Design a protein around this ligand. Structure first.
Ligand code: CL
Ligand code: CL
Ligand code: CL
Ligand code: CL
Lengths: 130, 130, 138, 130, 130, 138
């Protein structure tokens, strides 16, 4: 039940009030750049008119493959009247494949999360913000 | 057919306490998709006026059977005045049989949850939202 | 006398503290080495899945339970797909949790609730002994 | 710096607004009764016009000394307009010397906790509520 | 004398960042009491118009030195309109050197904590509230 | 150009998402294999206790830190007695936590704050390398 693994496939539905609902599956902007052998420390951050946040990530590249050995020193300043940061959390995957600083936010009309993530694979450091 | 009984609680609340055997789960909406051997990465998502959310699923398939090796990058953004998302957890079963993004919601008149789920069985990938 | 109905079995003690409040502290020996009586009289050998649920004007909730009965003794191997909708103004759900005992003798979906005049928990419970499956909501 | 271990000893202080403060130390109503050899199950409870709560305690008396091996099935119904139960928790000491069901409550003029406790020492079961 | 510096933060906030070496702790109020060899149980408490709380401390003294073997039965009841006790934790140091009952408080105009503490050193039992 | 001042060292990327918001994602290599410079120039050998603190009109907080410096290298063996008073209407403290690094290289007392126009954390930090003790509050 799959033609090509290039486009999104969705199941649609119309709710009792005539509102569309989409259940979908899809195969799959970021910052990436080279690393060096041994251990290194990095400040991973994001800055905008609304969200500003960062943390430190210690990485260790043994052989030609590295991982995040520690994620610490979480900082943040969010400017926006009425915004409520219900929760914030910095965590590292057991493998150390990545670290994420996640904020669960809320205002008068919405609830959502924002995420600053750092990923290490081989000798490559990738960051993202969603 | 199910086996049930009508109970009237002390506070007057009249309800139906029941049990029924099921073959397949009954969500609001579901979808089934075939998988190819090897590792593949997919975005699982739901979009509606009020609820919007997703996560990524890393699926691996050795010969005939496959499972979810990783459920990550949980994202959501809900729009509705006065809505509160008390809790949001993305989790994966130990056997990788499935992953579920569950939201505990609340507002001036109700308390409920919504669930975006992805389960893998053999060559099949099943998505659902309830 | 205010007929507890379990008061005849338990040893109780009326006490009062600091606040000058009057309440009864009590202890009662209970039996667990007993089978179920009211439950769904049958659940075939092997493995099977079940939908446990309570539906009413205010409280609505359910969960799935895979049950495994090898030879004669049956247990719950899993309690999943917790779902709920507690629709009523004034009512607030502060916490919800689905759990299964170590033995798999029972699974409970507990909700911590509150309204303008009270605070309390409610439980949707499924219990299994031998080839019997029973439920309760209190 | 201690005469007799029978009475309370306090350090007093007068706050900026002429309010007394007492820091004190003191050497030290409950329900108690005999147990039997082997394992047993007990319902520990309290009932009043305001607070009603209970839990089950499994006890195991090996030799002539016993302990609580499990505390479970926490139930409660508190009647009082305006009362808010911020938190509730049932826990057992590692040694199993006792179990406690603690409620952190709050209303418009106060914050306090209430506690139903079960204690086992030798072949004796003691309960209390504070 | 202490070593400090006056800092004016970006938002205009003017403060004093300092460090000072101390011999003894400086709480709002303290008390010292002698202990006898053997095990003894004590109630540690504080009473004032607004704050009232206590816990029990099991102290053991082998020949000259002693420590807290157990800090239990935490109790509190605070009176003040609009006051919120966000958190309350009773904990004991691994070495039994001390136990502390800490309350995180809040109201329309302030955020703070209060601490009822008991520390044991040798033959001495020191109580304090800050 | 809006002088970041660290922008010259880090590699940054301006991006935009779903919301149509404009922000800069960035990564910067930093050094930790460096000693302290501004800190309290002395902390004698052996063991000593210190009161770390910040006092101001709105934020006030402090904690104690036992420091152990054997031979030449010094570390924090304990961070205790966390105390605070954040007195200001509109300001809400959502969480507070005192922590010490594994190494004892530093101790941090972090507060999650909020007001009608912003959400942010503030930290009272004590760091120790060799025989140097420094502090900061940002
Ligand atoms: Cl880490
Ligand atoms: Cl029965
Ligand atoms: Cl237990
Ligand atoms: Cl420096």
């Amino acid at each position: 039940f799959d033609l090509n693994g290039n486009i999104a496939q969705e199941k649609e539905i119309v709710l009792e009030d005539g509102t569309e609902g989409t259940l979908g599956v899809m195969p799959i902007l970021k910052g990436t750049y080279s690393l060096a052998n041994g251990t290194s420390t990095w400040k991973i951050y994001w800055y905008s008119g609304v969200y500003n946040c960062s943390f430190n990530a210690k990485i260790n590249v043994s052989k030609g493959k590295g991982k995040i050995t520690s994620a610490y020193n979480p900082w943040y300043q969010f400017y926006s009247p009425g915004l409520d940061v219900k929760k914030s959390k910095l965590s590292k995957t057991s493998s150390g494949s990545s670290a994420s600083y996640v904020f669960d936010c809320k205002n008068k009309i919405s609830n959502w999360n924002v995420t600053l993530k750092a990923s290490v694979s081989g000798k490559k450091l990738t960051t993202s913000f969603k």
